[PDB]
């Protein structure tokens, strides 16, 4: 699976709210802006 984060979904917004550091978005984060949560 090469991981690429999503256009349409805001990386930075994301990581800035925290939505990256709650588990349960984790997931949500895998998919959507793994790049920019560093998983790869």
Same mark, same amino acid.
Not at 23 to 30: C, Q, T
């Given at each position: 699976?090469?991981?690429? &984060? ?5 990386? /930075? /917004?994301?990581? /800035?709210?925290?939505?990256? &550091?709650?588990?349960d ?16």
């Amino acid at each position: 699976e090469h991981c690429a &984060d999503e256009k349409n979904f805001d990386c /930075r /917004r994301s990581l /800035r709210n925290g939505d990256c &550091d709650n588990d349960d978005k984790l997931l949500e984060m895998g998919y959507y802006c793994p790049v920019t949560c560093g998983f790869c």
